[PDB]
């Protein structure tokens with residue numbers, strides 16, 4: 001049975017301005033392992049990754065009905081799909097992410113069998 | 114058991130032009146109760162409230178697989194619960210209705226899933 | 231019991247360029263029946279149909295955990311019923327498939343949920 005559902009949309013411009021102002025933004029939004037991936041990328045690619053991780057965590061927060069990013073983590077499997085490797089929920093989590101050159105979107109569904 | 118699913122995306126500029134046109138748009142899309150909330154807001158937040166209610170209603174109609182016109186907007190209503198989240202207070206369905214809405218300074222999006230246990 | 235979930239967004243301009251290439255884009259992406267519907271439309275409405283079928287096929291591939299470039303375009307088919315709702319008439323899956331599509335002047339998006 002379903003126990004929650006949430007979505008989010010975000011402009012890349014908002015993430016770009018946030019990086020400059022408080023140059024510690026990333027350290028507070030990403031975990032250690034996520035951070036390693038961030039620094040290895042460059043250009044638009046680097047910004048698109050940070051933006052997608054922020055949108056995914058926000059969708060999950062809305063799905064649980066609450067308003068701690070450090071106890072949430074999103075990685076990529078060998079085929080390339082994104083999945084939650086760490087979260088305060090013991091059921092199953094179904095996630096998906098997509099983008100364009102101007103913004104990103106994400107969708108989450110929570111289930112308990 | 115899932116019994117339906119629908120989504121919608123809309124440009125804010127399109128909703129703003131319709132209101133400025135002075136054609137009775139808001140009165141056609143919103144109920145009396147929804148209208149009371151609309152008039153208490155100001156600026157961009159006022160336009161985003163109308164846009165969100167329009168997007169959610171169109172999304173529900175696709176989940177039913179009928180589209181909206183065979184059924185007007187006055188047959189549906191969306192308010193905010195005691196936790197502050199949007200929900201359907203009126204609709205022709207007896208099961209559980211899962212709804213979510215989001216926006217930026219240029220677009221608004223909505224998603225609906227129907228279920229019965 | 232849910233078994234998969236996926237979403238996708240596509241730029242109209244990108245589909246247009248692919249077509250302008252003349253390569254033979256539409257022929258590799260659409261089935262015989264989808265193509266017959268495509269040729270009966272014109273103008274913007276024509277470019278919107280092709281873009282929507284591409285977005286839908288990619289959302290299903292991601293819901294299964296892969297990509298459309300690997301699964302193959304000719305193995306999936308999307309039609310419209312007598313009320314206008316879109317649905318999958320052919321696919322390599324045994325359960326139920328729930329789909330929805332929406333568009334603006336510049337973009338198109340789609341969402342899929344798999345159930346067994």
Ligand SMILES: Nc1ncnc2c1ncn2[C@@H]1O[C@H](COP(=O)(O)O)[C@@H](OP(=O)(O)O)[C@H]1O
Nearest residue numbers: 175178179180279282313314315316331332333
């Ligand atoms: N009765 C119905 N139920 C569910 N979806 C419908 C419907 N009639 C039309 N649609 C869908 O809504 C889409 C129109 O998008 P929108 O009005 O949100 O911009 C159509 O795109 P297609 O004709 O390309 O399949 C179609 O998929």
Ligand SMILES: Nc1ncnc2c1ncn2[C@@H]1O[C@H](COP(=O)(O)O)[C@@H](OP(=O)(O)O)[C@H]1O
Nearest residue numbers: 049052079080081082097098099292295296297
């Ligand atoms: N095999 C796969 N199955 C499902 N999703 C996949 C996938 N391979 C890549 N993706 C996703 O597609 C996203 C890119 O979306 P787009 O379709 O607009 O190009 C990737 O973003 P990330 O690499 O940041 O995780 C990733 O989440």
